[PDB]
């Protein structure tokens, strides 16, 4: 049990103001988040060299590099934790993992690769071929054309990324008699469109969509060497008599075939 | 001797097709080279993260990274070289190592830091302040103003890099009495100008000079793990019984204060 | 080797938060710096008392105290430096020691009696007597009048302190005959003005000079208790996820006869 | 000492008409001579296989072979030399060695590949591209153009070979006002033009120049197994009743890039 | 070391109120001082008989005597200095010894025969003959006439004694042309005039000079039996709750030919 | 040291009125250190001088051994105090003797108990060697040349300290020193030749020569100290006399190798 | 010591009226002289036979013989000198050996092969080719043309022989501006002209120069068996009643290539 190992080595290491555990990856098996769409890799080096494939729609090749960058998230806890072991375990849970997942989800989608940032999916992605658009298309038809444009890369699509307002407008969309185009409220099964998972995320700017062969075209490389640390600490954030629980991990993103990721905007 | 140990272990390890010697480094003591002017460091990592210092001309700081690049040189030979250790040594110094020294010295001095290149000294260097020039100054007096300008970084100058043509046209120079400034041919040999080492090299373009606090402004980081290797060419074509000999080393260059390295040109 | 011992005790003392090594002095009580001009003393106490001589221009006396203050310099290094001991030795080097020497050279020359500052040589210094100026005098001739003025204290002068701009303009100065006063740029290097040592330093304000009997006028009192200390930190809002390496020592400065130090400004 | 051991083994081995001493070459560090410009090598076989590079003016490769050829120099002495060992030591001296260094310099420079001869640098050399000339070029400007043409091989020049009449007329060149241009007689002695070694040699024909990447483009291979030999003889038919002292060595010359050696003639 | 031996015996002997060390004279086992111009000698009695020489302007002889007087200099230090031998050594230094040199120099130059004083050079000295002066003579020309007047004693001058203002205004002497007559600030520092040592000293009154055959005509006699001592004290009422460190020595002065020493004053 | 052994042997050999010590010699550069050295056990010596036409001619000469002597007056109780007698017989007495041999060797005459000195035998500087605009430094260079006409080479320059202070701190028209700053005047070297700056040389006079080959000091050994009480020293004024002295001859084999001159200005 | 041994054997072998000590060479084979420029050799025979090379300006040859001749020099001493061994040692000194050096220098330079003389360097030498002289050339510029003319022999120049007047006139040469053209008295001392040694000697006639490859073109053959000798004598009508001290050595000079020695005369 990850949370019981974590709680045990924190209380065993705590000196009275600092404690630590070696949580080698937070990723299980190494809504959906952006990192659940991508492939996973494991590394002992701070930099990675890889061969990118460029497609003409033939194959050409080039050397690329990715450097490991650090992602960190923290929560404040009652100082009653850290002698009560099963209270500590109830903080090392789904909210601590979901907070870190929302932090990497912004770097993997949007990052401009200079300085402290990762290289983002939206930076490398191919432009949507608007010549596919036809009279009578809905915004749902524009996604169905983008799923086709992925196939020019040899690979096939595996997920869709949207802003939460655009997914709300798409799902409530109505045919001319006053009937839902997804079918009525008791039917459709949350975040699915044309049989692919949707990731509706705040990182995706409004009016923008992204669809791609994410399980094949790109890979998250995890440095291992992730940690949970706990401290008594001074800050501008209600530090009266509290602990801060901090967890952090080191990642890189390798884009093997950027023709298999399509970025577009809706016309309206 | 290094060439003796290399040539011996190359024949001792040789199969019909592959041989190897693992050199710790090609740098003796882990004219002067450009590498003899800079500071030395050792690392296990593929990349270094460091902080650069910018001086207003009170310090400002930024994160930088240097990836450990590979510097390599190779020679074609014939299978007789593996039958004759004197003949191997004659390639493992007079051909291969003489070619690698001029290879790394062009990277450390001139590397435009894209792709497989190091970022070299002449790319980070600060321009010579031409406003320092005075009425009737010589090419020697331009070097004095640049030795002054290095001190605006808090560091003193520690070496001067010239083309051998420009060093000859400086060393044999007389002041207007009819007397040498530095000395006769005994100043062109024994490469010292005003008590600072001169490095005369083909890598410095004619008419360009560089002066700096090199032992304090920058450091070479060496991965260790250099190799000399011999391989049978199954490539054949027109050339029968072909053998390739290769040596390579892995380096990064870190520039901590580029204000301490001045680059300029002589007017003619 | 100091660097090799300091690395051993930094990794052996490391808690995953701090590590410490004791230097019984860096050097200093085993170009020149301001500390080379002054006399040296060794002390086992954190405060000290002394008598100050006050020359009439007979001897008046007063009682003074000096408190031992801390002088500190730091370098930022990557978190991996504690995982690789040759990478630690590669940072415990001459650039660390020269940086502390440039730090104390600011306190010894320009410090104040307030907070953790030392009392600086420029605060106790007596003014230059401009009644000594003759017609057609230069910035060089003004230093000769100040070397005379030090003799009114019963002491002869032992050195001169200038900004690098001011030393450059003095050394490269031309006489009315169209030729150098001091010899050429061979005299800007090898820092001597009329047999006295020149200390050209970025600590000294532009247009200000100081000349004095420094080894008879004042003494640096050294506590020993110098340290190299390593930490995870993020303060002064510089750089994130970085290790700090700190070297520091404890010093007092005593001024026994302030009449033997002259300060002035060049009007030219 | 060499002259001691040679004289002892000559008188020890002597029997009525011949005697011999074996020496591992006469080249130490195993004006300059031609053999000082070239790379050195050591070999245990009377033939060598090597790969030449051609440059279009991209790279191409061809097999070549060099066969080891004999070079010998002799001096005549009176027969009393074999009965007075200090008189032998007085003939085994620097004049005997410098004669062999002058004998091989004619083969390395002008030899044809036929019979008992080396293939020399002037045979393989690329012709000077006379399209580079202008009306009003001096003989020194023609050398500057030839130094530029070496770069089209991707190597750079390392020496210049001239006749002594031609070096004298380059160096001692007087201007229209009666001053010296290319240095005075201080350039003719201590042989340097533009920071490159000049080899003024009577083997080079008058009106002919050669310049190239000699340190990189060609190599001299020495068999070891050289000999000092003494004989009763009456060949050449000059001098009767005499003793012959002979020193001889076995060499091959390998040219790896003939595009890097430029040969031409002056206008005048 | 002297400071090591002095401090160790002071703390060994201290007994809560008085410490003593027997320094058998201070370095005279043998700028300059008056004691460096004169001859030296070693005495075992406190009264001293000697013979003087008078010169008519043949030699005449007369009985004379000198009495050994005491010269003493002191420093005040904090009470902790007797509890820390390194801190005691930091006060037994060159600043202590240079203080006695200033104390003895006023006794040797100006002293009376009366009381605890030595009879000084300015008392025995012959008056400068003003008939030697000529119209518009400089202060240097007066010194030249006075150097000449010493020859009337048969001896020749061996040193010149001036006030620092008078030496400054002799050396920095600048003509109406706007340039130095006597060699300027280089002549002022490292004090030589006409191949004789200048001793610029505060003991010499402004406007007054002394010149003589000091090395031949006069001798300092040293008793041995100097001391370094330490006490708690409250004489002269200056400073309270302080330790006093005393160095004292016993000297006499013998004058053998007073005609060889000239005293005068300047015209202008 | 000498004066250690001399003082204990004087206070020991002393019996009321007489006491005496003898030694096999007492010992910037001195004039004596420029010259060749020889040891002799005779009170006169015969030698041949070489005169060079500027062919060679020869003549007979004699080097008579002369005593060089210095004496001082002291009160009788110096014999009661060994470190005080020692202070006389080196800081008063032995210093003045070294100043006195140097004036004999430089500029004595053959007459009486004098040595004939270097400046007495020396040949005149040829003023026709001077070019227009020559300095005092350039006059030394011409005199270094003029020694070579003797077949010997120059080996030292003898100056007054005034003249050496002028020449050492001499600047060319670029404003650089011709020799150096304090390392010209101290470290007594001019163009690799030793300088001897001595008070015995008249101001404005110079001497340059082949001193190590042109001349030789023949040393007799047996240098001495005597203490005397005998005359009106004691029986009116209670004094005594201390005298110390050494025996030398100087032989000049080739005077054409020694050049004497005076500066133009 | 040599003088210890020479005196101790002269006094021991002196019976009645003559005595002798045997030596080898006077330490050649244990300013520069003419014998320092030449090659050395050692022989047990009183005649030597050798081949001379002649050159067109192919190598032609002729046989030669050289006969050992005596060089002798004497000093006259008093008859006292054999009675006092320290006086004999005082006469066996450097004034004697430098006398012999000046004696052999006059034979080796100027001798004619007739009678008791050697064949000298100036008799065999090649004439200076006055066609080399250019407009506006100084006497120094003529010596540079003669340094070139030596190279036509296949040898480089190794020294220059001048009369001392001519060397003074060349080194102290003054420009129209009143400054030294060659560099002045610092070049007359330290006998170097363009890196070649100068030998100024009274053996060279005024207006004549000689320049050659002396160490490669002629050899002094020394018989060993030299002597120091003492005799009663009366001859040449100079000096009477006087002892003679004589030293002598046996030499031959072999000229292997007279084309390498150049002799000429200055125009004025």
Numbering used by the authors:
A (entry chain G), B (entry chain A), C (entry chain F), D (entry chain B), E (entry chain E), G (entry chain C): 76 to 105, 131 to 157, 173 to 383
F (entry chain D): 76 to 102, 131 to 157, 173 to 383
Show me the paper's own sentences about this structure.
Tailed bacteriophages and herpesviruses use a transient scaffold to assemble icosahedral capsids with hexameric capsomers on the faces and pentameric capsomers at all but one vertex where a 12-fold portal is thought to nucleate the assembly. We have determined the portal vertex structure of the bacteriophage HK97 procapsid, where the scaffold is a domain of the major capsid protein. Assembly of this large complex from hundreds of protein subunits requires transient association of an internal scaffolding protein or domain that acts similar to a chaperone and is absent from the mature capsid. The mcp gene 5 encodes a 103-residue N-terminal scaffolding domain (mcpN) and a 281-residue C-terminal domain (mcpC) that exhibits the HK97-fold including a triangular A-domain; a P-domain, composed of a long spine α helix; an adjacent three-stranded β sheet; the flexible E-loop; and the N-arm.
An initial map with icosahedral symmetry imposed was solved to 3.6-Å resolution for exploring the global organization of the Prohead. Our focused reconstruction of the penton vertices had sufficiently detailed side chain density to build a 30-residue model into the spokes (inset), which are composed of residues 76 to 103 of mcpN. This segment of scaffolding domain adopts a helix-turn-strand motif with residues S76 to S88 forming a rigid α helix lining the interior surface of the capsomer subunits, followed by a turn, and residues K92 to G97 adding an additional strand to the three-strand β sheet of the mcpC P-domain. The final model reveals that the density is discontinuous between residues L105 and R130, showing that the N-arm region is flexible. Hence, compared to Prohead II, the N-arm is not visible and the cleavage site, K103/S104, lies in a rather unstructured part of the shell. Our higher-resolution cryo-EM map of Prohead I shows notable differences with Prohead II, including visualization of ~25 mcpN residues bound to mcpC, displacement of one end of the spine helix, reorganization of the P-loops, and a complete absence of N-arm density. Our data show not only that the Prohead I P-domain is constrained (the spine helices are bent and even displaced from their positions in Prohead II) but also that the P-loops at the end of that domain adopt an arch conformation, preventing interaction with neighboring capsomers at the pseudo-threefold interfaces. At the icosahedral threefold, the P-loops interact closely with each other, but in a manner different than in Prohead II, probably because they align with the long axis of the Prohead I hexamer skew axis. The scaffold C terminus binds to both the spine helix and to the P-domain β sheet, which suggests a potential regulatory mechanism of assembly where the scaffolding domain locks the mcps of assembling capsomers into the Prohead conformation, thus constraining interactions between capsomers to specific sites that guide correct assembly and shell closure.
